[PDB]
Amino acid sequence: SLALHKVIMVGSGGVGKSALTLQFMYDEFVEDYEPTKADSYRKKVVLDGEEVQIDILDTAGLEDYAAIRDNYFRSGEGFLLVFSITEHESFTATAEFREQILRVKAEEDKIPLLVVGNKSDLEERRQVPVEEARSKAEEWGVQYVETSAKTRANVDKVFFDLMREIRTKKMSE
Amino acid sequence: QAGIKEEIRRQEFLLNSLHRDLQGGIKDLSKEHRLWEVLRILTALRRKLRE
Ligand SMILES: Nc1nc2c(ncn2[C@@H]2O[C@H](COP(=O)(O)OP(=O)(O)NP(=O)(O)O)[C@@H](O)[C@H]2O)c(=O)[nH]1
Ligand SMILES: [Mg+2]
């Protein structure tokens, strides 16, 4: 459906998948950390003049069961692959997450995807140089965006840009 | 909150059955749509629980 875009948040624990989701959905941000099992949301938005809906599936940083993870990943239309700029290990984890996505959607050529470096408000704690993440995203053929779920910086941008990638794919079919 | 907690349990049972159905299956968009729908209900029920 060109009027309903299915977005999955993917990335390791604590990087801010839920914080980005809840900032986008409700303009809320809390400092608490409650690990996700799985949550989902639907919002009406206007995307480049057209009224559409975005569905968001917010995943666990580590899923107990491969089948559950595969079921979720296979159902997505586009992915926000999130790491925290303050945790280099979360950046290295994105490579394996991407492989899992590609494997479960093997019949699709170019999967809508953005790499998101979150917690940009914590610049003084950065462990991932901007150039390292930009270079990796270029190697994957996708946009790199740095966000802060806390301050709202580039939060709408990552969801709207991913929706534009999904819309482009849908029109090409 | 007993009523909400029991409905969460009911929807979790349905979520588990949909995961069972979907695993290793022929692509089934209708069942995927129901999976996200059940999750949306679960998320809404839990939001109500926390005030
Ligand atoms: N300063 C700051 N803190 C953030 C930001 N995004 C998330 N956090 C904080 O980081 C912690 C983890 O956030 P959360 O959204 O739960 O991360 P998650 O990726 O959903 N974790 P999980 O995989 O366990 O569900 C929380 O304490 C949250 O407040 C951000 O942009 N800036
Ligand atoms: Mg979470």
Numbering used by the authors:
A (entry chain A): 11 to 183
B (entry chain C): 395 to 445
Provide the authors' own sentences about this structure as they appear in the paper.
Ral GTPases have been implicated as critical drivers of cell growth and metastasis in numerous Ras-driven cancers. Upon association with and activation by Ras·GTP, RalGDS activates the Ral (Ras-like) small GTPases, RalA, and RalB. The Ral GTPases share a panel of effectors including RLIP76 (also called RalBP1), members of the exocyst complex (Sec5 and Exo84), and the transcription factor ZONAB. Our solution structure of the RBD of RLIP76 in complex with RalB revealed that the interaction is mediated by a well-structured coiled-coil domain in which more than 80% of the interactions with Ral are mediated by the C-terminal α2 helix.
The tightest binding sequences, termed HLR (E427H/Q433L/K440R) and SMLR (E427S/L429M/Q433L/K440R), displayed affinities of 5 and 3 nM for RalA, respectively, a vast improvement on the wild-type RBD affinity of around 100 nM. We obtained high-quality crystals for both the RalB/RLIP76 RBD HLR and SMLR mutant complexes, which diffracted to 1.5 Å resolution. The HLR mutant increased the binding to RalB 28-fold, which is broadly similar to the improvements seen by SPA. A variant harboring the single Q433L mutation was produced and bound with a similar affinity to the HLR triple mutant, indicating that the Q433L mutation alone was sufficient to increase the affinity for RalB by 25-fold. The mutant RBD structures show that the side chain of Leu433 contributes to a hydrophobic network of interactions involving several Ral residues (Ala48, Leu67, Tyr82) and Trp430 of RLIP76. In the wild-type RBD complex, Gln433 points out to the solvent, leaving a space at the edge of the hydrophobic pocket where Trp430 is buried in an interaction known to be essential for the binding affinity. When the Gln is replaced by Leu, the side chain shifts toward the pocket and fills this space. Replacement with arginine in the HLR and SMLR mutants allows this hydrogen bond to be maintained while an additional hydrogen bond with the backbone carbonyl of RalB Ala48 is gained. However, the K440R mutation only exerts a minimal improvement in binding of the RBD to Ral proteins, as evidenced by comparison of the E427H/Q433L (HL) double mutant with the E427H/Q433L/K440R (HLR) triple mutant, which bind with similar affinities. The replacement of Glu427 with histidine or serine breaks a salt bridge formed with RalB without forming any new interactions and ITC data demonstrated that this substitution did not improve binding to Ral proteins.
